[PDB]
Amino acid sequence: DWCNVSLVDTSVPEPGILEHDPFFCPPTEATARDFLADALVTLLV
Amino acid sequence: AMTIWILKVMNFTIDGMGNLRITEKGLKLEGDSEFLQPLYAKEIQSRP
Ligand SMILES: *[C@@H]1O[C@H](CO)[C@@H](O)[C@H](O)[C@H]1NC(C)=O
Numbered sequence: 001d002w003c004n005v006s007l008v009d010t011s012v013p014e015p016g017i018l019e020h021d022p023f024f025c026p027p028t029e030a031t032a033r034d035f036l037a038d039a040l041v042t043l044l045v
Numbered sequence: 046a047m048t049i050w051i052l053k054v055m056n057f058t059i060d061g062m063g064n065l066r067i068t069e070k071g072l073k074l075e076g077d078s079e080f081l082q083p084l085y086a087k088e089i090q091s092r093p
Pocket residue numbers: 003004
């Protein structure tokens with residue numbers, strides 16, 4: 001059938017990260033103190 | 046001397062117990078609050 005003869009040639013058909021930033025959540029930094037020496041002073045006076 | 050010790054321990058500034066304030070409803074905390082031991086709760090209903 002010559003009517004459905006198809007010819008095709010070459011053509012030019014030419015058509016991940018994860019991150020979220022919150023603002024802050026710092027813990028108790030510099031965790032050290034004492035309430036004896038000052039108590040000793042104010043109970044030694 | 047004992048009363049000055051109380052004022053030094055609890056830090057009774059001009060405006061109440063430091064940043065902490067006590068009102069009719071309950072505690073109003075004008076400072077951060079990090080607890081060393083586990084806390085408890087009943088509800089947490091943030092305001093609209
Ligand atoms: C190609 O074949 C189909 C199916 O038989 C037909 O419908 C169509 O008419 C044909 N095309 C031509 C150009 O004859």
